[PDB]
């Protein structure tokens, strides 16, 4: 899992793919070895921001109301006040879809409960549940940094994917996305990168090609 190798399973995987009428995004298999994903101590579910970014960037909801409201509608990002809040809670139709269409939510602190109660339901089944961050917080930093942020998750079983980038990234581009994955693994467990038993790269609809370790 050294840089020249990496960037060798990113060419061979971009060559192997077929071409599509899309932009087709670079996925990471990574297959854990020797891990006991019954204790959650052992469960990897990281939010790692990617140097490179993501690719396309995501759809970011704020559910908050004030000046923290004023400042995501100004960045045009969708804003949920608690008016919209209510609604939404009586309407299991129209909050199915904003949870699908949306790939990160930041709430405004004091509205969780109130999130927890009326969008819960929705949100976290599907593992979206908004990030708090206080009333006053400058949501630029935060938005910059969700905009190249993905989320390893192993969940209880010993294999995950994560998208590292699409085909109009170079290839160090995607090196550098996948070795950033890869220091985290890395870094939680103590043995270290043992635990990856094998690691491929895929296009959308290319076939797999192992990183060499």
């Known amino acids: 899992m050294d840089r020249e190798n990496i960037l060798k399973a990113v060419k061979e995987a971009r060559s192997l793919a077929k071409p599509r009428n899309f932009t087709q995004s670079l996925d990471?298999?990574?297959?854990?070895?020797?891990?006991?994903?019954?204790?959650?101590?052992?469960?990897?579910?990281?939010?790692?921001?990617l140097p490179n970014g993501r690719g396309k960037?995501?759809?970011?909801?704020?559910?908050?109301?004030?000046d923290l409201a004023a400042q995501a509608e100004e960045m045009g990002l969708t804003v949920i006040r608690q008016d919209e809040l209510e609604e939404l809670g009586?309407?299991?139709?129209?909050?199915?879809?904003?949870?699908?269409?949306?790939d990160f939510f930041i709430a405004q602190a004091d509205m969780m409960p109130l999130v927890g109660k009326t969008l819960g339901p929705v949100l976290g089944p599907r593992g979206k549940m908004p990030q708090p961050v206080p009333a006053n917080a400058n949501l630029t930093p935060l938005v910059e940094r969700?905009?190249?942020?993905?989320?390893?998750?192993?969940?209880?079983?010993?294999?995950?994917?994560?998208?590292?980038?699409?085909?109009?990234?170079?290839?160090?581009?995607?090196?550098?996305?996948?070795?950033?994955?890869?220091?985290?693994?890395?870094?939680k467990?103590?043995?270290?990168?043992?635990?990856?038993?094998?690691?491929?790269?895929?296009?959308?609809?290319?076939?797999?090609?192992?990183?060499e370790k």
């Open 146 to 187: 969700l905009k190249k942020t993905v989320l390893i998750n192993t969940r209880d079983k010993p294999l995950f994917h994560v998208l590292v980038g699409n085909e109009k990234m170079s290839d160090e581009e995607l090196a550098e996305n996948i070795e950033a994955i890869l220091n985290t693994v890395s870094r």
């Open 57 to 66: 960037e995501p759809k970011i909801a704020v559910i908050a109301k004030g």
């Open 90 to 102: 009586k309407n299991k139709k129209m909050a199915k879809k904003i949870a699908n269409e949306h």
């Open 189 to 211: 467990y103590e043995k270290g990168l043992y635990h990856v038993k094998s690691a491929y790269t895929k296009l959308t609809m290319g076939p797999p090609a192992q990183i």
């Open 28 to 49: 990471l298999i990574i297959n854990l070895k020797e891990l006991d994903l019954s204790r959650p101590e052992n469960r990897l579910k990281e939010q790692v921001v």
